[PDB]
RNA sequence: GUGAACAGCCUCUAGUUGAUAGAAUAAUGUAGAUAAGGGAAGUCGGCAAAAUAGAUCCGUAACUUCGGGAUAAGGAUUGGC
RNA sequence: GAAUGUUACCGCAAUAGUAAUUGAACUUAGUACGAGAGGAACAGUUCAUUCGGAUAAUUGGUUUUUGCGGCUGUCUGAUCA
């Protein structure tokens, strides 16, 4: 399970939902719902759309940079998957939710 | 030494497998005959892992790695990466790569010391490959063939290239890779040498269609058989002339 | 191809049924019986 | 004329006549063969179609191209609160089919089944089974005599059960009453089990379990009078043809001078009883088990109820059965769960399922969040919040 | 599946009916392929045969090298451009449909394949995957 | 085509072929027509019947003509073999007769269709159709003998050997029963009679073997006698023409024992007579049955014949015996070396080096200590293939990938990754030393709390 | 007013509320529409739909009776302040 | 749909119709068979063409929810509406 942040509005894209677009440049874009895909087809700018999270990030709403947001980095390291580490990760996520 | 093996009904050993000097990867398609075929030569000496990449049996072309590390495409799910890491010792580095290309096995042809990459491969990917594999990286094409990972086979003992490689190109590439190179064919004249077989410093696996002259040439060039570091290739000259 | 009324296929299916196929259903029914009895024991 | 071209016909001639079902609750035509060796168990159950949802599970299927892969497929959620047995029916094998010998009620019928016996329930004086219940008087010989008569002659035993409608979020208060055949040997033991279960409740967990193959029978979606074009898939005429284009243009010929029953004319579509078999059960959720929608992977304290509730359905609070694919019948329709009628342990059924993640996002619109907590975390605090 | 194809193929959306034109995705010199027939297609009244990602079809070269004109050769579709349901739980489509000419054994004629190659086609055709530099 | 023309379509005799064609025409085509129908309908029906019969006959004749190898301009060796076996003159005459019958049937069908297109009555059309059918039947009946002969020749040619003249092949020559069949059996795996009677092999026998990774095929022949070729049997002519046409290197076998009662003088005379065929073959003399003669114990006068044979430039003498088959390997090696040298000489009418531009091959100690697997050893490895076999075989056994993958402790080997926790999947947060980052965040929170950040 | 225009639409003076209606929106029709991928592979036949449509600018061929073709064709813009 | 004392529930089934069809991927196999070329079959599995029954989980299409936002002309004095 690799739930993706929507390329348009950064919203989660759960399995079985949305459409994925593959460009000739091998760029994969996932649209959570038909609205985002159709807006991309019209070449609308997400940064200029008031309902897109990208616009809010630059507008100074829902602060883009914070210490808590560094934990959600899409790491490429295959951690050895230690059960104790697994439990500590769940506890850290639970605490980080409240902190964020 | 060289051993004949086949997939379900495909002679492209390198497509559905990736054999290195310290680990081997096989597809989970159909049954364990391929796994048992690999075990019959390697046994339990080195790990053999059943793994898929992007939910496909082509992990061999999708992945490229050496004794020092393994590389997987961005399309690989985290579950597959975790399974591969757990099935492999910590001595083998594993890291995902992010670039326009995805066919690492076809985009990268490399051994434990020297690596060949696609000319258009990005700088970040080249640096990551160099750091992970501890090998020199050079921008090259095999006689104009841009898919270095599919039309060429490389190993510490030697390398093999498709028959269309020019003599000057072979001479240049052998010097660059610091290993001997020979122009030949696998799977009864198939030009995709890099996909029709897999090879390491002590074991070679090829399709059943590989004729006896091709198997002998592979053995001579890759220095598998004892006391045959291309020495017996001189005797094979007459056989090749008669056949050719 | 062979249809449902194909004698050989029917015989093979019957042999499979006598195999672990019927034992699986028997185990499932045995498990269900325990919960059926528990429904009254509770 | 040999038509110059051979093509398959349109529609199935075996499903005719294509008429409306006799009743909303389809009656089971046949029951699984009674295994005399097996213990007494319930052969079917009554549920209500709550809706549908998405499920992703790692598929364990040797020889398939999707081995060790997470294949996404649809499942149906059926509300199935515990059912209560309120009687038993004995049948005697006659040369002219099975015949009902007698029926016994458990001295106390719930108000839900009492409503079933009256159309104008509120106007009715509610003179319910009280008289027959009085047959359970000091001696109660009549009930015992009927039970002994059932034991002596009945060949098969069918129990009478009704769904707890009050436990369902359905707006109706009248419950459905139907018979369920009892399996197992010692037909005396069948009636003994029925008597011990009189006025008691039976949960689905005691009838079906995970990975069990079941057959669902229910009345299909109704659509009223439908054109032959969609009722049978007839090819549309090119354009603006006289007498319309969405109809069969040729109905007969010189001989015979009568319209054949197989010409596939227009008529009522839907609302027809249909039997679907080999439906794999994926999840059996307990009513009191919190986090029913939590798998071994998700482990999040969330139920299977979609955000904002099921579309055209409620907020399921009791035991439910999850089965792959789809089942005929609309939401709020009663669906009967029936066994496979045979050994259906084919490797498709023998394989054990393992749900990786369960979809609980809102089916009302393009829901993007699984639980309100996720929505609040993503959208953050709003104007009304502070 | 047919000859050359390895393993079984799961059904996907058929976005390439007979007579469709798709851009060539191989360096053989062909520009576009005109589909005249679909290998393994079904037989039904009035139903036009249709191809899909990974299917083998017979197509003629409408434009490109003169030597390739007037002759029909087998081809393998690498892009479809019509959304199809992947078992992973996502609907995806390519920017433009394309195909590569191949022999009846599935061997590739061109030494390289340009543009992304569908995952299904690459998995179903080992030679295509070996000659594909980009997958998905 | 060449190389075992086994796919020739079987041809039934004239009577059987006519019966089959007539039955097919009667069955496939409609047979119900009435006088009340329009004359056009009857004419069309009868014309269609005649056309169907003609098309069936034409298809049969075309298939028969196509199936055969077209002996002319196939290959000198194959052409000569066909001529010697099937009497090429008669074979060509029969096939030409079949072709002529095909054209006659076509002409008859066309003429009868043209005549019937003007039919005026049901009886007239029926008579015309019957006349066309009878003409076709008579034409087929005239083909009785050629069809019967062609069936047999087709069977024989399908059952004939298929040797490639352009390939490197061996050839054994000598008197009958000298040991040609025994040598062929020993050198290569083949099924050939090794009985001692006059003519053990009545035709050519082929056997393949591999030397130095090159494919070789050995050819055995019945042999030839001292006849001057003025009178000879087809059996001997087959060997003669096989020697003549084939580039194969021929080996002349000899038996000095009392067996093969053509004495050593007769063998030497036969060798001298066949010498013209031996000019370009790089011949070698093989003395068979050495176990009972040992020509070292041969009279000098008799050895004079061997010396005279040796006088030819390219001949050499070899010693071998059927019981002592070890010499067969030496003879095979000598013949292969001679053939390869000749072909290399006629043909004329490499690896790269690093050059130095440290790296050395690497092999794990486990591989060095690994023992060779033995399929027939009862104590061999578990053979995970065999493990799957004992668990139901392919398509039934479910392989637990978690069995072998390495983890710090096997006590949690069969665990499950949650992979999700109310969004922000676990895999993203998976990273060692979480305690340090959590403690840093807690310190930041403590600073903010006492700083009054959260009012 | 908009608008090249007595072109289409709204409003002003003035004149009308006249065409049997009520309750749903089954099939099939009358009139007008939308559509994932292919773009005529359907049909005897591009039958019917669709596509460019005004203004400004670049530019405009074969032929020719030199008058025409021509708005040939093929291309770039059109809002508000 | 009246009529069989009435209403309601649960049933049995005389009778009428009926259905599923075909291909390929492994294993068994590069084994029997072969001089070589090449190539079997059953059992267990896995997909697929056509047809039939369902349902919108997910995706596409459809909009009178005229639900929301925008645009031209014109009218309510301007704005909002
Ligand atoms: Mg003999
Ligand atoms: Zn989005």
- Domain range for E133: 15-136
Distance (Å, rounded) from C-alpha D225 to C-alpha F223? Answer: 91
- Asked if residue F247 lies in contact with residue F370, where contact means CB atoms within 8 angstroms, the answer is no
Q: Which chain C residues have any C-beta within 8 angstroms of a chain D C-beta?
A: 17, 20-22, 24-26, 28-29, 31-33, 35-36, 38-40
Beta-ladder partners of D202: D83
CB atoms within 10 A of CB D371: 18
Distance (Å, rounded) from C-alpha F152 to C-alpha F175? Answer: 30
Residue E42: Cβ-neighbour burial (10 angstroms; 0-12, 13-18, 19+): exposed
Ligand approaching nearest to the C-alpha of F179: 1
Report which of B217, B229, B172, B176 is spatially closest to residue B193, judged by C-alpha positions.
Answer: B217
CB atoms within 10 A of CB E11: 8
Nucleotides on strand H lying under 7 Å from protein C-beta: 7-14, 17-28, 30, 34-37, 42-61
- Backbone φ, ψ for residue F304 (5° rounding): -60, -35
Sequence spans of domains, chain B:
1-226
Distance (Å, rounded) from C-alpha B41 to C-alpha B203? Answer: 8
- Asked if residue D120 lies in contact with residue D132, where contact means CB atoms within 8 angstroms, the answer is no
Distance from CA of A34 to the nearest CA of E (A): 12
CB atoms within 10 A of CB B59: 27
Distance (Å, rounded) from C-alpha E76 to C-alpha E40? Answer: 13
Q: F389: CA distance to ligand 2 center in Å?
A: 50
CB atoms within 10 A of CB C24: 15
The strand order across the sheet containing B159-161 reads B152-154, B159-161, B181-183
DSSP F373: P
Q: Which chain D residues have any C-beta within 8 angstroms of a chain E C-beta?
A: 5, 7, 54, 56, 65-66, 69-72, 235
Sign of dihedral through CA atoms F86, F92, F96, F99?
A: positive
Read out DSSP for B94-120? EEE--SS---HHHHEEE-SSEEEE-TT
Beta-ladder partners of B94: B70
Between vectors from CA B170 to CA B165 and to CA B171, what angle results, nearest 5°? 155
Which chains does chain E touch, 3 or more C-beta pairs < 8 A?
A, B, D
Token pair recorded at residue F185: 């059996």
Token pair recorded at residue E133: 């530099």
Token pair recorded at residue D373: 């907590």
Distance (Å, rounded) from C-alpha C30 to C-alpha F83? Answer: 81
A62 CB-near residues (< 8 Å, 6+ apart): A53, A56, D380
* Amino acid D216 CA to nucleotide H53 C1' distance, rounded Å: 13
Helix locations, B33-109, DSSP H: 33-42, 59-62, 78-87, 104-107
**Is F175 labeled as ligand-binding?**
yes
Place of tokens 């319930």: D42
User: F418 touching B, CB under 8 A?
Assistant: no
CATH code (residue E135): 2.40.150.20
Distance (Å, rounded) from C-alpha D221 to C-alpha D312? Answer: 15
Q: Would E8 be classed as within a structural domain?
A: no
Between vectors from CA F211 to CA F210 and to CA F214, what angle results, nearest 5°? 75
Interchain proximity B16–E7, CB inside 8 Å: no
Q: Please compute Rg for chain A using Cα positions.
A: 16
Identify the closest residue of chain A to F440 by CA–CA distance: A67
DSSP C21: I
- Asked if residue E84 lies in contact with residue E63, where contact means CB atoms within 8 angstroms, the answer is no
- Asked if residue D166 lies in contact with residue D112, where contact means CB atoms within 8 angstroms, the answer is yes
Distance (Å, rounded) from C-alpha D190 to C-alpha D35? Answer: 12
Ligand approaching nearest to the C-alpha of F197: 1
- Asked if residue F88 lies in contact with residue F24, where contact means CB atoms within 8 angstroms, the answer is no
D116 CB-near residues (< 8 Å, 6+ apart): D162, D174, D175, D176, D177
User: How many Å from the N-terminal Cα to the C-terminal Cα in chain E?
Assistant: 21
CATH number of B1-226: 3.75.10.10
CA B131 to chain centre: 20
- Asked if residue D354 lies in contact with residue D57, where contact means CB atoms within 8 angstroms, the answer is yes
- Asked if residue D355 lies in contact with residue D56, where contact means CB atoms within 8 angstroms, the answer is yes
- Asked if residue D129 lies in contact with residue D188, where contact means CB atoms within 8 angstroms, the answer is no
Distance from CA of A17 to the nearest CA of E (A): 6
Token pair recorded at residue D40: 């007494």
User: D67 in helix, strand or coil?
Assistant: coil
Token pair recorded at residue F330: 């030496």
DSSP D136: G
- Asked if residue D52 lies in contact with residue D82, where contact means CB atoms within 8 angstroms, the answer is no
Max alpha carbon distance in chain D (Å)?
Answer: 83
Tell me which residues of chain F, numbers 160 to 179, contact chain A at a CB-CB cutoff of 8 Å.
none
Q: Which residue is nearest to nucleotide G26 (CA to C1')?
A: D225
CB atoms within 10 A of CB D300: 21
Resolution as reported, in Å: 3.4
Q: Rounded to whole angstroms, what are the CA distances from F33 to C15, E85, F26, F53, F65? A: 55, 57, 13, 18, 36
Token pair recorded at residue B107: 């985009």
Does B have 3 or more CB contacts under 8 Å with C?
no
Distance from CA of A85 to the nearest CA of B (A): 14
Distance (Å, rounded) from C-alpha D380 to C-alpha A100? Answer: 10
A14 CB-near residues (< 8 Å, 6+ apart): A3, D359, D361, D368, D370
User: B96 touching A, CB under 8 A?
Assistant: yes
Number of structural domains, chain E?
A: 1
Token pair recorded at residue B212: 């006896």
**Is F428 labeled as ligand-binding?**
no
DSSP D285: E
Helix or strand (DSSP H, E) at B181: strand B181-183
Residue D9: Cβ-neighbour burial (10 angstroms; 0-12, 13-18, 19+): exposed
Distance from CA of F132 to the nearest CA of D (A): 28
Token pair recorded at residue D145: 């005599």
Token pair recorded at residue E48: 């036009």
Distance (Å, rounded) from C-alpha B64 to C-alpha D226? Answer: 60
Read out DSSP for D164-175? -GGGS--S--PP
Beta strand E56-63 with F214-220 is unpaired
F154-186 burial by CB neighbour count: b if 16+ within 10 A, else e? beebeebeebeeeebbbbbbbbbbbbbbbbbbb
Enumerate residues near strand G (beta carbon within 7 A): D 224-230, 238-240, 243-247, 266; E 13, 15-21, 48, 50, 80-83, 97
**Is F16 labeled as ligand-binding?**
no
Helix or strand (DSSP H, E) at D156: strand D156-162
Distance (Å, rounded) from C-alpha F410 to C-alpha F395? Answer: 28
Return the percent helix, strand and coil in chain F, to nearest 5: 50, 5, 40
Place of tokens 């409240």: A98
User: A5 in helix, strand or coil?
Assistant: strand
Token pair recorded at residue B40: 């019959």
Interchain proximity B43–F381, CB inside 8 Å: yes
Distance (Å, rounded) from C-alpha B120 to C-alpha E134? Answer: 12
**Is F220 labeled as ligand-binding?**
yes
- Asked if residue B14 lies in contact with residue B194, where contact means CB atoms within 8 angstroms, the answer is yes
Place of tokens 């939910």: B55
List the domains of chain D with CATH numbers: 16-81+203-220+270-384 (2.40.30.10), 82-202 (3.30.1430.10)
The coordinates were experimentally obtained by cryo-EM
Distance (Å, rounded) from C-alpha F424 to C-alpha A73? Answer: 10
Distance (Å, rounded) from C-alpha B27 to C-alpha B80? Answer: 12
Helix or strand (DSSP H, E) at D229: helix D228-232
C-alpha dihedral, D260 to D261 to D267 to D270, nearest 10°: -150
Phi and psi based region of residue F70 (left: phi greater than 0; alpha: psi -120 to 50; beta: remaining) = left
Size of interface B-E (CB pairs under 8 A): 80
User: D214 in helix, strand or coil?
Assistant: strand
Distance (Å, rounded) from C-alpha F349 to C-alpha F329? Answer: 31
Q: Looking at the partner chain, which of C22, C31, C39 has a beta carbon nearest the beta carbon of D203? A: C39
User: F251 in helix, strand or coil?
Assistant: strand
Q: Would E4 be classed as within a structural domain?
A: no
- Asked if residue E128 lies in contact with residue E56, where contact means CB atoms within 8 angstroms, the answer is no
Report which of D155, D132, D153 is spatially closest to residue D86, judged by C-alpha positions.
Answer: D132
Distance (Å, rounded) from C-alpha F383 to C-alpha F381? Answer: 5
Beta-ladder partners of D71: D57
Beta strand D320-324 with E16-17 is unpaired
């Amino acid at each position: 399970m690799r739930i993706y942040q929507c390329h348009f509005c950064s919203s989660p894209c759960y399995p079985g939902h949305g459409i994925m677009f593959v460009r000739n440049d091998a760029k994969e874009f996932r649209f959570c719902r038909s609205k985002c895909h159709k807006a991309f087809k019209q070449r609308r700018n997400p940064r200029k759309l008031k309902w897109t999270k990208a616009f809010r990030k630059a507008a100074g709403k829902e602060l883009a940079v914070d210490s808590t947001l560094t934990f959600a980095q899409r790491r490429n390291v295959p951690v050895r998957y230690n059960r104790e580490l697994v439990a500590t990760t769940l506890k850290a996520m639970a605490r980080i939710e409240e902190i964020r | 030494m060289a051993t004949r093996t086949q997939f379900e009904n495909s002679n492209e050993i390198g497509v559905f497998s990736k054999l290195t000097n310290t680990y081997c990867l096989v597809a989970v398609g159909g049954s364990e005959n391929f796994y048992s075929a690999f075990e019959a030569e390697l046994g339990d000496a080195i790990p053999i892992v059943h793994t898929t990449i992007a939910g496909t049996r082509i992990i061999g072309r999708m992945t490229a790695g050496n004794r020092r590390g393994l590389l997987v495409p961005t399309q690989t799910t985290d579950q597959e990466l975790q399974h591969l890491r757990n099935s492999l010792p910590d001595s083998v580095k594993i890291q995902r790569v992010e670039e326009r290309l995805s066919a690492l096995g076809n985009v990268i042809c490399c051994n434990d010391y020297v690596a060949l990459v696609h000319p258009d491969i990005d700088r970040e990917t080249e640096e990551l490959i160099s750091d992970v594999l501890g090998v020199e990286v050079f921008r090259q094409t095999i006689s104009g063939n841009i898919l270095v990972g599919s039309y060429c086979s490389l190993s510490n003992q030697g390398g093999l290239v498709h028959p269309q490689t020019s003599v000057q190109d072979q001479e240049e590439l052998s010097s660059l890779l610091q290993v001997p190179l020979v122009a030949g064919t696998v799977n009864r004249g198939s030009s995709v040498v890099g996909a029709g077989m897999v090879v390491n410093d002590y074991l070679a696996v090829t399709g059943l269609d590989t004729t006896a002259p091709e198997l002998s040439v592979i053995e001579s060039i890759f220095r598998l058989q004892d006391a045959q570091p291309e020495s017996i290739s001189g005797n094979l000259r007459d056989t090749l002339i008669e056949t050719y | 191809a062979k249809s449902l009324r194909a004698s050989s296929h029917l015989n093979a299916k019957s042999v499979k049924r006598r195999g672990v196929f019927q034992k699986a259903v028997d185990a499932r029914e045995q498990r269900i019986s325990d919960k059926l009895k528990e429904d009254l024991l509770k | 004329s040999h038509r110059k071209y051979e093509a398959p016909r349109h529609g199935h001639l075996g499903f005719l006549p294509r008429k409306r079902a006799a009743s909303i609750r389809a009656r089971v035509k046949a029951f699984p063969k009674d295994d005399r060796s097996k213990p007494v168990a319930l052969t079917s159950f009554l549920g209500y179609k709550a809706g549908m949802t998405t499920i992703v599970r790692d598929l364990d299927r040797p020889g398939s191209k999707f081995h060790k892969r997470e294949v996404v497929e649809a499942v149906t959620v059926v509300d199935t609160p515990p059912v209560v047995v309120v009687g038993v029916v004995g049948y005697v094998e006659t040369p002219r089919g099975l015949r009902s010998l007698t029926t016994v009620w458990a001295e106390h019928l719930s108000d839900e089944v009492k409503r079933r016996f009256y159309k104008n329930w509120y106007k009715s004086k509610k003179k319910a089974f009280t008289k027959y219940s009085a047959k359970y008087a000091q001696d109660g010989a009549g009930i015992e005599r009927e039970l002994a008569r059932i034991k002596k002659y009945a060949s098969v035993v069918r129990v009478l059960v009704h769904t707890q409608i009050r436990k369902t979020p359905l707006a109706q208060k009248k419950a459905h009453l139907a018979e369920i055949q009892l399996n197992g040997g010692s037909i005396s033991e069948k009636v003994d089990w029925a008597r011990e279960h009189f006025e008691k409740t039976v949960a689905v967990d005691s009838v079906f379990e995970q990975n069990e193959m079941i057959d669902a029978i229910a009345v299909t979606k109704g659509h009223g009078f439908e054109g032959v074009t969609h009722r049978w898939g007839t090819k549309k005429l090119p354009r603006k043809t006289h007498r319309g284009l969405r109809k069969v243009a040729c109905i007969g010929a010189w001989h015979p001078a009568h319209v054949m029953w197989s010409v596939a004319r227009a008529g009522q579509r839907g609302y027809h009883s249909r039997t679907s078999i080999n439906h794999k059960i994926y999840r059996v959720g307990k009513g009191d088990d919190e986090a029913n929608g939590a798998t071994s992977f998700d482990r999040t304290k969330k139920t299977i109820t979609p955000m904002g509730g099921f579309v055209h359905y409620g907020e399921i609070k009791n035991d439910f059965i999850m089965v792959k694919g789809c089942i005929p019948g609309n939401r709020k329709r009663i669906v009967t769960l029936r066994k496979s009628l045979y050994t259906n342990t084919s490797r498709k059924a023998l394989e054990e399922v393992s749900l990786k993640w369960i979809d609980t996002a809102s089916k009302f619109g393009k829901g993007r969040f699984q639980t309100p907590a996720e929505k609040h975390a993503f959208m953050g605090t709003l104007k009304k919040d502070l | 599946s047919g000859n050359g194809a390895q393993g079984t193929k799961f059904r996907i959306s058929l976005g390439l009916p007979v007579g469709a034109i798709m851009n060539c995705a191989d360096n053989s010199g062909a520009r576009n392929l005109y589909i005249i027939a679909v290998k393994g297609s079904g037989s039904r009244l009035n139903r036009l045969p249709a191809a899909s990602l990974g299917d083998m079809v017979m197509a003629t070269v409408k434009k490109g090298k003169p030597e390739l004109r007037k002759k029909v050769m087998p081809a393998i579709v690498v892009r479809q451009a019509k959304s199809w349901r992947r078992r992973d739980g996502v609907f995806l489509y390519f920017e433009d449909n394309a195909g590569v000419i191949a022999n009846p054994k599935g061997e590739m004629k061109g030494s390289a394949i340009t543009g992304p190659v569908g995952k299904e086609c690459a998995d179903l055709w080992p030679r295509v995957a070996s000659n594909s530099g980009v997958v998905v | 085509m060449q190389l075992s023309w086994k796919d020739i379509p079987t041809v039934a005799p004239a009577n059987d072929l006519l019966d089959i064609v007539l039955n097919r025409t009667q069955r496939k085509t409609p047979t119900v027509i009435r006088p009340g129908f329009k004359i056009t309908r009857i004419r069309a029906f009868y014309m269609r019947k005649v056309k169907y019969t003609g098309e069936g006959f034409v298809e049969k004749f075309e298939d028969i003509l196509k199936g055969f190898p077209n002996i002319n301009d196939v290959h000198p060796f194959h052409r000569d073999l066909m001529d010697t076996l099937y009497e090429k003159n008669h074979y060509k005459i029969s096939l030409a007769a079949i072709s002529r019958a095909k054209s006659l049937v076509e002409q008859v069908a066309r003429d009868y269709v043209r005549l019937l297109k003007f039919g005026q009555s049901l009886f007239q059309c029926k008579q015309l159709k019957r006349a066309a059918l009878g003409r076709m039947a008579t034409i087929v009946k005239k083909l009785r003998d050629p069809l019967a002969y062609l069936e047999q020749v087709r069977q024989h040619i399908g059952r004939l050997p298929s040797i490639d003249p352009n390939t490197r092949t061996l050839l054994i020559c000598g008197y009958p029963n000298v040991g040609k069949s025994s040598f062929l059996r020993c050198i290569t795996k083949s099924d050939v009679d090794v009985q001692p009677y006059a003519f053990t092999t009545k035709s050519l026998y082929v056997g393949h073997f591999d030397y130095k990774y090159l494919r070789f095929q050995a050819i055995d022949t019945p042999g030839i006698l001292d006849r001057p070729t003025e009178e000879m049997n087809n059996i001997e002519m087959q060997s003669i023409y096989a020697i003549a046409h084939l580039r194969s290197c021929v080996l002349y076998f000899m038996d000095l024992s009392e067996q093969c009662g053509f004495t050593i003088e007769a063998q030497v005379k036969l060798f001298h007579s066949i010498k013209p065929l031996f000019a370009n073959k790089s011949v070698m003399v093989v003395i068979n049955k050495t176990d009972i003669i040992r020509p070292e114990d041969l009279d000098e006068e008799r050895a004079q014949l061997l010396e005279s044979v040796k006088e030819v430039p390219g001949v050499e003498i070899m010693t071998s015996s059927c019981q002592l088959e070890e010499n067969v390997m030496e003879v095979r090696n000598k013949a292969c070396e001679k053939l390869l040298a000749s072909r290399i000489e006629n043909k004329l009418k490499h690896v790269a080096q690093p050059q130095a531009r440290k790296r050395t091959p690497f092999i794990p100690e486990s591989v060095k200590n690994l023992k060779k697997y033995d399929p027939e050893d009862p104590n061999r490895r578990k053979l995970a293939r065999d493990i799957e076999a004992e668990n139901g075989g392919a398509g039934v056994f479910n392989v637990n990938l978690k069995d072998k993958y390495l983890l710090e402790d096997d006590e949690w080997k069969n665990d499950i990754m949650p992979e999700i926790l109310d969004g922000k999947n676990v895999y993203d947060f998976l990273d060692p030393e979480i305690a340090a980052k959590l403690q840093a965040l807690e310190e930041e929170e403590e600073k903010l709390e006492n700083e009054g950040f959260y009012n």
